[PDB]
Amino acid sequence: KTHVQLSLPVLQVRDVLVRGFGDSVEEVLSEARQHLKDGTCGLVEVEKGVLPQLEQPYVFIKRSDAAPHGHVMVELVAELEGIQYGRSGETLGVLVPHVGEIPVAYRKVLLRK
């Protein structure tokens, strides 16, 4: 399928144990996609002071359309030293590995895979 219905655990930035997916734009997008497929991907909602607490490159989920079965259509955009790889809509949050942190909520998304 070109799209996959996911429910992403929303994590508090201070709980996150692994604060990024790797060391290159290509690696973080690769790793993010693998974790999304394996159900091992968390979401951190971006506010003032969140991003400087996480590791670059960042992976964002961004709204790709204006929401089947409650699932917002999203795609991945990476960012490194203020340059983004991809173009999409509004940020829903920053992706991080999920290694068993307790979430505060779930974000239903339809991921363009």
60 beta partners: 77, 94
Task: Look up the CATH number of domain 3-112.
Answer: 2.30.30
Residue type, 77: V
Asked if 1 contacts 73 with a C-beta cutoff of 8 angstroms, the reply is: no
Task: With CA atoms as reference, report the closest residue to 10 among 55, 56, 61.
Answer: 61
Asked if 2 contacts 110 with a C-beta cutoff of 8 angstroms, the reply is: no
Question: Which pairs from 72-76 meet CB under 8 Å and 24+ separation?
Answer: 72/107, 72/108, 72/109, 72/110, 73/3, 73/109, 73/110, 73/112, 74/109, 74/110, 74/111, 74/112, 75/111, 75/112, 76/29, 76/32, 76/33, 76/111
For 32-60, b/e burial (b = at least 16 CB within 10 A) is bbebbeeeebbbbbbeeebbeebebbbbb
